[PDB]
Amino acid sequence: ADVFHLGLTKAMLDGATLAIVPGDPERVKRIAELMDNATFLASHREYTSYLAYADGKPVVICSTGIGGPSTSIAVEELAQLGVNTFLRVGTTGAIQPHVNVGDVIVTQASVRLDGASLHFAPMEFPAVANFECTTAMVAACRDAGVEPHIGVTASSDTFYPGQERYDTVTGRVTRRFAGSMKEWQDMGVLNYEMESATLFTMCATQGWRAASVAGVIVNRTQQEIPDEATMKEVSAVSIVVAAAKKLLA
Amino acid sequence: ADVFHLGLTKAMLDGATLAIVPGDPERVKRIAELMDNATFLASHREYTSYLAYADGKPVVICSTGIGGPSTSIAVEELAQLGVNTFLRVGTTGAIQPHVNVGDVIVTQASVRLDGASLHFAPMEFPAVANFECTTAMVAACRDAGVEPHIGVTASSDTFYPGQERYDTVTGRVTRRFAGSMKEWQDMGVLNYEMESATLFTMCATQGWRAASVAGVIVNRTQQEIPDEAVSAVSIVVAAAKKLLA
Amino acid sequence: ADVFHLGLTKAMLDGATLAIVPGDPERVKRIAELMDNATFLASHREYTSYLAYADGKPVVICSTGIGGPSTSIAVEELAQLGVNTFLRVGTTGAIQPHVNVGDVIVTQASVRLDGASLHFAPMEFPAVANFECTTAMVAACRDAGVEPHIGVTASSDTFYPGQERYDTVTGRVTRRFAGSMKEWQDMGVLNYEMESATLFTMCATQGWRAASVAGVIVNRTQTEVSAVSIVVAAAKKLLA
Amino acid sequence: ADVFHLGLTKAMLDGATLAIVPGDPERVKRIAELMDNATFLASHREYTSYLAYADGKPVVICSTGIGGPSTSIAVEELAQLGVNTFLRVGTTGAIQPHVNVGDVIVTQASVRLDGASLHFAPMEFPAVANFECTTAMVAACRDAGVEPHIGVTASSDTFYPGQERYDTVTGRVTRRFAGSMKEWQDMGVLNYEMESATLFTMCATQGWRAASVAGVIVNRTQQEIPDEATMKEVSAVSIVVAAAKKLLA
Amino acid sequence: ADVFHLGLTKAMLDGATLAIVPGDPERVKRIAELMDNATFLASHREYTSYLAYADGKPVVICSTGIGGPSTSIAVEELAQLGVNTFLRVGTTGAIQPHVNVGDVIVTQASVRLDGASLHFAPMEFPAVANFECTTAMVAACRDAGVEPHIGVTASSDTFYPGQERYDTVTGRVTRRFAGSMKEWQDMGVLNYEMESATLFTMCATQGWRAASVAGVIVNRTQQEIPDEVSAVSIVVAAAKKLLA
Amino acid sequence: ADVFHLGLTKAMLDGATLAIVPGDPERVKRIAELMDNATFLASHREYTSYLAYADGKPVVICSTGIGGPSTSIAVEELAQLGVNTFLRVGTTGAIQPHVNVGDVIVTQASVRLDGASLHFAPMEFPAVANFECTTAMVAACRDAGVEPHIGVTASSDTFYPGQERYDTVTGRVTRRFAGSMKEWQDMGVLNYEMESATLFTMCATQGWRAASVAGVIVNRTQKKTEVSAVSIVVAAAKKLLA
Ligand SMILES: O=c1cc[nH]c(=O)[nH]1
Numbered sequence A, D: 001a002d003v004f005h006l007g008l009t010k011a012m013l014d015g016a017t018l019a020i021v022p023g024d025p026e027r028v029k030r031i032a033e034l035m036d037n038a039t040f041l042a043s044h045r046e047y048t049s050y051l052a053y054a055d056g057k058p059v060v061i062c063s064t065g066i067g068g069p070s071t072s073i074a075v076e077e078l079a080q081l082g083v084n085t086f087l088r089v090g091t092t093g094a095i096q097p098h099v100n101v102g103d104v105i106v107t108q109a110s111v112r113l114d115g116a117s118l119h120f121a122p123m124e125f126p127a128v129a130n131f132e133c134t135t136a137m138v139a140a141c142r143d144a145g146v147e148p149h150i151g152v153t154a155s156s157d158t159f160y161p162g163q164e165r166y167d168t169v170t171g172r173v174t175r176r177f178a179g180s181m182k183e184w185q186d187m188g189v190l191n192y193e194m195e196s197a198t199l200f201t202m203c204a205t206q207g208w209r210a211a212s213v214a215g216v217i218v219n220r221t222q223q224e225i226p227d228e229a230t231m232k233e234v235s236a237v238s239i240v241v242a243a244a245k246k247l248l249a
Numbered sequence B: 001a002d003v004f005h006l007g008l009t010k011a012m013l014d015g016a017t018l019a020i021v022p023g024d025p026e027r028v029k030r031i032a033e034l035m036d037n038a039t040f041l042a043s044h045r046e047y048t049s050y051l052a053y054a055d056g057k058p059v060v061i062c063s064t065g066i067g068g069p070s071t072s073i074a075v076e077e078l079a080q081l082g083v084n085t086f087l088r089v090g091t092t093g094a095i096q097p098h099v100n101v102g103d104v105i106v107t108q109a110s111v112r113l114d115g116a117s118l119h120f121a122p123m124e125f126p127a128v129a130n131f132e133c134t135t136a137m138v139a140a141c142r143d144a145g146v147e148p149h150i151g152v153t154a155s156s157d158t159f160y161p162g163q164e165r166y167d168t169v170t171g172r173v174t175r176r177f178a179g180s181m182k183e184w185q186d187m188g189v190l191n192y193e194m195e196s197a198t199l200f201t202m203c204a205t206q207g208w209r210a211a212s213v214a215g216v217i218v219n220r221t222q223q224e225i226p227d228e229a230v231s232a233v234s235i236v237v238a239a240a241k242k243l244l245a
Numbered sequence C: 001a002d003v004f005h006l007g008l009t010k011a012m013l014d015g016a017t018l019a020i021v022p023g024d025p026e027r028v029k030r031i032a033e034l035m036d037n038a039t040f041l042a043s044h045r046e047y048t049s050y051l052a053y054a055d056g057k058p059v060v061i062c063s064t065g066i067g068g069p070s071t072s073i074a075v076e077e078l079a080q081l082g083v084n085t086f087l088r089v090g091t092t093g094a095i096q097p098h099v100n101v102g103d104v105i106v107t108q109a110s111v112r113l114d115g116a117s118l119h120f121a122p123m124e125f126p127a128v129a130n131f132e133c134t135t136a137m138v139a140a141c142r143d144a145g146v147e148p149h150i151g152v153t154a155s156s157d158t159f160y161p162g163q164e165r166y167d168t169v170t171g172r173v174t175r176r177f178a179g180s181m182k183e184w185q186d187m188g189v190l191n192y193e194m195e196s197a198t199l200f201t202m203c204a205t206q207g208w209r210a211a212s213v214a215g216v217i218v219n220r221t222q223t224e225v226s227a228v229s230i231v232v233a234a235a236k237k238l239l240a
Numbered sequence E: 001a002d003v004f005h006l007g008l009t010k011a012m013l014d015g016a017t018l019a020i021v022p023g024d025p026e027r028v029k030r031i032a033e034l035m036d037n038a039t040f041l042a043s044h045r046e047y048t049s050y051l052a053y054a055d056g057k058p059v060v061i062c063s064t065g066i067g068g069p070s071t072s073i074a075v076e077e078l079a080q081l082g083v084n085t086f087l088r089v090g091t092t093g094a095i096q097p098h099v100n101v102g103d104v105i106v107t108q109a110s111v112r113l114d115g116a117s118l119h120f121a122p123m124e125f126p127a128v129a130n131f132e133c134t135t136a137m138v139a140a141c142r143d144a145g146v147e148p149h150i151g152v153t154a155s156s157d158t159f160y161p162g163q164e165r166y167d168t169v170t171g172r173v174t175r176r177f178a179g180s181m182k183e184w185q186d187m188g189v190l191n192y193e194m195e196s197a198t199l200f201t202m203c204a205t206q207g208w209r210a211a212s213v214a215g216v217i218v219n220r221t222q223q224e225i226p227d228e229v230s231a232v233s234i235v236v237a238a239a240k241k242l243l244a
Numbered sequence F: 001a002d003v004f005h006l007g008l009t010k011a012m013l014d015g016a017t018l019a020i021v022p023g024d025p026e027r028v029k030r031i032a033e034l035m036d037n038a039t040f041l042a043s044h045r046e047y048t049s050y051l052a053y054a055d056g057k058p059v060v061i062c063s064t065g066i067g068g069p070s071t072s073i074a075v076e077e078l079a080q081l082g083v084n085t086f087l088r089v090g091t092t093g094a095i096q097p098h099v100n101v102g103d104v105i106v107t108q109a110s111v112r113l114d115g116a117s118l119h120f121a122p123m124e125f126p127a128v129a130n131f132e133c134t135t136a137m138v139a140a141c142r143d144a145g146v147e148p149h150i151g152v153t154a155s156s157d158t159f160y161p162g163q164e165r166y167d168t169v170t171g172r173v174t175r176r177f178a179g180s181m182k183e184w185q186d187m188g189v190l191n192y193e194m195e196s197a198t199l200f201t202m203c204a205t206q207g208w209r210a211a212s213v214a215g216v217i218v219n220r221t222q223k224k225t226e227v228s229a230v231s232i233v234v235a236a237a238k239k240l241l242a
């Protein structure tokens, strides 16, 4: 391999410069198969990669793992191999009551409740998505009959206390994060996820473009964790593939 | 008046929901006369306001003064009068060699080198402009034959040390800010101004829409003080008409 | 213009080394006319400047605008023209019950609830007024038969949330400022304003002298000319 | 499942109260096989879990993925299933010249160069391992003829800039981390890894025991990335299994 | 003197490489007298120092005063004199209800509620004790019939607001320390003392060994002020173990 | 006792509202004997306390130990017995080339390089002396024919690395403190000491008055001075209590 974790060489990407980067290694294939001549490339650790062709141009599909540290490796190592555009597709918990389960979120920027983003810029720097790629995501959403929620996402290094979940072993949240959900609600923050703060900060600062679209799987104003009663439309995966086509055409 | 500083009452605004907010009280009239039926509203301290109409729609034009603290008062008091959309038009120093004096920057989001932003959200919160309004600014640039630089802006509470100007009385920059310009350059930050970090944070947290377009009057890879020597204001008025259509 | 924002040259100051720096451009003329031979210098943006003469010596009167950022420009650019002493005058809202409307506050140092101070020193550095000029303000107070409240002022980048006002469109105060007025009250802080943290920190760290006097117009728990006559008296004291 | 990510129920753990938690899902099976009746439980995302028995006592082996956010989910979820003891096993880069490739480090505490620890305790709290489990890990190294390095570890949310690697696409490290390796070096910090600060802080604060043994795969005073010239003793996985047995006996 | 505050020369230490460092200058002599040939060395400011012998080997016993800043001077100056190992012995207030007055706490690491620690490393660095010396302390406890409580200690620059005492002139704690005791309790923190964050951070960063044992003189789940030692016997036993 | 560390009761102070607070226990008696009817009160740990009379008004002289933490205990326990004014006296190293050995400093406010100040107010609060006590100190200087340097002091929790000293075992200064003396020097800071941040902040926030005078005995850039600064502080006490 040309890179230390992903098991990939430059040749294996066949010139791809755009990556679709889901969180879950098990989603990779399905995303890939929405495009042409999808091919398995590698699987190492949380990093499963496929190659596919979007209207004839190579796209790499590579999972990140949960959270900013595994994301950071993925994004660096793909860029080492010539990727300069990273489209994240993900799942997310809504924190606003009007954002329904099954709705899609396009994140313009993120609250940096992570540590990896600080390793690319001080906290003063905005974890902001690339304008053209965000535009492409919005457009793919609307083309699909869906108006996305567009706004700010709370991007937390944890799933439990940092997203102010109480149904845990201790049922306690450290002071900084106690009441924090309300803080972000009040500020109009749409949702919680775990990677976009790192992805956006690292891409804005290193000269790469990123965007993120995500499907809402739970509304935190009603459940901490979704279950079988949770509402079971258009898919964030289809949208991202459509967005990638826009950007490569 | 029904607000504390601006000298305005709601009826004065004729239903305006959108403000164009330059820093310079003297730009207010000149923005306003690009529009129709320019009407003086009030002038107190650094806050001169005009009502004018953009293709039949009322728009307030209200200066902010230099910097976030005075901006925060104007944005708040306007919003108390029904303003929910704030378009900043400003001047700026570029810090990338590829950005020319005369060019326009549309700021997607801002590095928070201000303090007023912290009175609306802790630092982790992004100082991000509204997507729809930024889209409008970009379209207004392009409808005018201008390709804007669209990126991040360093928004500083000072013009001198925080923008790492050395041509001062003491010629020193405190440690945090020494080497800072290069830091932001390396990060692909386009430019320096003084208001957008506050403007964006307070609008994003308070449920209002903001965007900012600015004319590049100095390139900091060349010199500190801008040469005395429009495009930006015509773009903002163009964008206001897009948003109010 | 020798200087980019104020539209002043050094020659226009006639060697003035002391400035009175109110916040409001519209109050500069009237301050200036308390001294001799007041003359209009320039008006750009929020910066209106006058020259006048106190007991024969020139004194510049220049408005700062509201808040540290605009103040930091005025101060730096006046200093480039040879100013080395800056006397702030203004109004304020008190937060202690024993500080009545019609009193005078002399700020000895400020809680740094601003950003611009940090562009001159890290937060550990105290936002402290100059001893000599503070002393002159006190003395001018007492000459006018006013025993001033001498203490700490909370110097905020905002008028609204940073001063824990809830009479706003959203009625929300961010967490860090929720309960903050009471925090400052308990610590004996006298009042809120919006420029002294910046002014003080920048003058202390750059070698200039600063002090600040303000008339209490309102008390958050429950004169204008007085504050101006005192600052003019203080200027004379310092230039004598 | 009774936890949201791991796909596990409490019954699947056969009363296990201790987990060994490597980072790589592909290493779980292997570690499980140094114990008895190795039994696959689940595999979801980067989280592969096995049950095995260590001199008769049940032990869960579960991958964390890279970094503290993924680790934090596994640790919380295991603990909801009754685990109260977490033994990290992993690889590390040494930052002292006398810490050799092949050596093992038992971390007593970590420099918190992470975000996830702060969702458990403010930065003043020490990211300290449990004394008893640290002692057993030392004892298990010595039992095997290995004298471990015992000291402080730099625990970084990133592999690249936060570990002051410069062989990257931009070759730049943000101000805060430029020169940081020498700061940790000078302080006698032994090594870099990417999970222990989160693990330790989250366990110390929630009432669980944790410890970490790791093998040194590169010395950063000589190479950023190990390659085929790099040296390649008793394994860190052997030690951890040995520690587990001690602790459960 | 060879150093700026302690009034000590390197010769006076007779090759001692290990110090016992109590907080209280008046405990110094009592500790020294549990060893052989105890000899007053010096007394300046809060720094009272003795020499004594543990199974033939010299040990310096030198007080620190209360708090990190005076501790930082003493540890630095002793180390200038060849000391590489610093065993703190002290008093403390327990914040967990299962810890009794008269019990002993061995601090593995400390919450850095101090400022001097920052002068050796940024806050991210753990205020962690030396493994070997802690081991010695635990072992000394157990040989004495005392099971020590081993864990995390809140190491505070103040006795009053920083340990969230309210029985004070103003009866107020600044926001950051309001609720803080409950915070640390919830995180399993055992106790409050005033020196260990600084001692541990400075030793760990500068290549010296340190450990701390303390007698529990109050339980804060019951009251603020202690009612009017075995910790000293234990630390002397630990020094013996380390020197043997 | 009333108070746990100092071993004092209120009665013992004979109504004293003002303490002189030097660092060294050994120095208390001698400072007390510049006043009348010096009277031993107590001695525990590094806290030696004396009562004496300053032009017929009761004054406590109480040592603090080195540094903020031990000072915070003394000032709190004294305040619990009615003391509302605290005058710090001591020696210091100057960092400005214009401040000569034997000069006197009156600290108007301090750089907070200390942790205890944070246990009273967040860092944005200034570590400022009381104006009236500062004025008294300045007057006492001038009555003794001394013009004091009046400005900002860097108040450090360490003697060595926080004062950017490299004459240490390791010879190392952590990054934050690397180049820090030059930093303070450029800002006009006069000197380093180790207590005034703490004393100033706790006093300002708790409603008590404080000030600090120090005799310059070393200058980083280059007995009798000690005595001068002690005479000045006794003189200021007299002025304040008049
Ligand atoms: O609530 C949720 C759902 C998905 N991902 C998250 O980080 N949080």
Ligand SMILES: O=c1cc[nH]c(=O)[nH]1
Pocket (backbone or CB within 6 Å): B091, B092, B093, B094, B159, B163, B192, B193, B194, B217, B218, B226
């Ligand atoms: O350089 C410049 C020009 C205008 N405004 C700024 O903030 N900076």
Ligand SMILES: O=c1cc[nH]c(=O)[nH]1
Pocket (backbone or CB within 6 Å): E091, E092, E093, E094, E159, E163, E192, E193, E194, E217, E218
């Ligand atoms: O409660 C107590 C007792 C002694 N030492 C402390 O720091 N706290």
